[PDB]
């Protein structure tokens, strides 16, 4: 199938870390598409720019709720207020990450649990928080990662622990979902060197490598989430899939199923 | 390069979950070598019975610490104490895992807070605990995982985030150890479906797939951590290692480091 802007046309859609970066660029391409909109992050003040320029671009209805995805009680209730808000969910946009340096990990156990707090176990939350609405509308969640998430690199280890917790974690919900007939699909977005100012700050002085467009990454990722695909990539290097792809897992995968007792699903 | 005993001659070998399983397999298998060995697990009855009987195997010294991986801080002290205990450290075989059984993801999140603390971050505490000892030994880390920190299966989400954590946390340690010139190795162990009874009893009427003797596992998990293997496979199939083996990742991963500045190593 091809994607048409018209598959967003009055459709529900909650992004996170939507102040800045991706997750805002995510929310103005869904307001062009005439989408109902609710954003979050930690700056009210933030969002409230964000949330006007939505409305100023053609948003069905625009809305945010401020505070820290570090508070998992915050992460369960935002999805509630936001469901209650729009009148249910079609599509879930897991974008927040909490700030990260690039350093060779020394120590700071209570940094990595802090990186897993914010970075995996508020999606999980959230997922979990929002599934039964997503259930109802036969909707998609949008599950943003890395390269970092399918491979290793120097001086991001917490990061890259929480963002391959995301990939074990919801490719398992997702078979889940297959198995017993639940049309709501997990798009895991794989991503490269994005030129947001958070990330160039972070690479400056270490990393040599190109960025690619924060708009046309964010509207890829809103593309494939709507396109229903299991995974997104969206690199400078048109080799990242091949080499990143894993059909020997995807195998694996498909063969493991064969050992389950069919009663369980 | 081929592995022999007497490469474990002597050395300080630190052993998680211990008291059963292949815990206990390795414990024993390290005795026989004749090895110093410190094990860990909650029942300090457990633990008793298998530091007898690897002292009774030809252990070069046997002792155990009780207690849960839960606590972070139990999880840093025993390292030092275990440090002590033996002058220092050779080798730490990182074993032990939170209950899990095999049920489709619902809600129970605080059991997924649980997983990730057992299962991954006292990993992080307690490798960051041992790493001076091991940079002195020029030693080794074992980080025991399984397929399904490699691919998906379901019933097991929580766990595959666990295992799927590790990947990503110690694949970028070996990286950033190797780049800085240190030479201590990590072993992630990537297993199949072993012959333990706490497995055997957990897919019981849901998976019907053959099992691996668990003493064979262990020799294979010390063997391939000894020879300072980047990775071990262990499970029936031939065929599992070039499936789940990844080398588009390997190409991936050595061509990042091009893009650092060499300086900051
Ligand atoms: N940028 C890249 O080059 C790049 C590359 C590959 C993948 N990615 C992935 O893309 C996603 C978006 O990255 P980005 O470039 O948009 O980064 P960004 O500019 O740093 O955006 C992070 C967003 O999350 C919010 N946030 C931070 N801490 C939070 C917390 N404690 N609670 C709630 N919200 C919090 C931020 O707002 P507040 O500070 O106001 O809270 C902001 O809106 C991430 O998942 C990242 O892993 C990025
Ligand atoms: N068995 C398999 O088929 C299989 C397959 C693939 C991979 N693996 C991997 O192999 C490793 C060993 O598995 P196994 O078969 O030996 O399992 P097992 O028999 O369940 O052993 C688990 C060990 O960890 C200890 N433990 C449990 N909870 C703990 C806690 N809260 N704090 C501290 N220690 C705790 C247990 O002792 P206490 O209960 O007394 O605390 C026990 O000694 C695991 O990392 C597992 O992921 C196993
Ligand atoms: O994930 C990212 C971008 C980031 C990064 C940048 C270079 C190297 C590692 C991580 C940026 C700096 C940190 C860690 C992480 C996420 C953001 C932006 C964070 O601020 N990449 C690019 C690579 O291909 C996967
Ligand atoms: O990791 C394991 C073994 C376990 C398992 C068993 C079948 C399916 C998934 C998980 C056993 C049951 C649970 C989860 C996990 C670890 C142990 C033993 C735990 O008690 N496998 C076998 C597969 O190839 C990777």
Redesign the pocket.
Same mark, same amino acid.
């Given at each position: 199938e091809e994607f048409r802007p018209e598959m967003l046309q009055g459709k529900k859609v909650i992004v996170?870390?939507? /102040?800045?970066?991706?997750?805002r660029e995510m929310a103005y391409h869904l307001s062009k598409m005439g989408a109902h909109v609710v954003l979050?992050?930690?700056?009210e003040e933030?969002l409230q720019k964000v949330v006007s320029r939505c409305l100023e671009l053609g948003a069905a209805s625009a809305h945010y709720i401020a505070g820290?995805?570090?508070d998992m009680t915050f992460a369960e209730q935002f999805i509630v207020k936001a469901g209650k808000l729009m009148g249910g969910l079609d599509m879930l946009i897991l974008?927040?990450?909490?700030?990260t340096s690039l350093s060779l990990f020394h120590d700071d156990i209570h940094s990595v649990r802090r990186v897993m707090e914010?970075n995996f176990l508020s999606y999980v939350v959230m997922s979990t928080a929002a599934l039964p609405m997503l259930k109802q509308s036969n909707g998609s969640i949008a599950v943003?990662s /890395?390269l970092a998430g399918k491979m290793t690199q120097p001086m991001i280890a917490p990061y890259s622990a929480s963002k391959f917790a995301l990939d074990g974690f919801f490719s398992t919900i997702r078979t889940e979902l297959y198995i017993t007939k639940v049309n709501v699909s997990i798009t895991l977005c794989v991503?490269?060197?994005?030129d947001?100012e958070?990330?160039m700050k972070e690479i400056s002085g270490i990393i040599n490598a190109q960025?690619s467009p924060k708009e046309e990454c964010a509207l890829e990722i809103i593309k494939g989430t709507a396109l229903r695909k299991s995974e997104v990539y969206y690199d400078k290097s048109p080799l990242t899939p091949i080499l990143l792809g894993n059909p020997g897992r995807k195998i694996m995968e498909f063969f493991s199923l064969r050992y389950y007792n069919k009663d369980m699903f």
């Open positions: 996170t870390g939507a /102040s800045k970066g991706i997750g979050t992050a930690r700056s933030g820290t995805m570090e974008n927040h990450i909490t700030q914010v943003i /890395s991503l490269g060197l994005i947001t958070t990330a960025a």
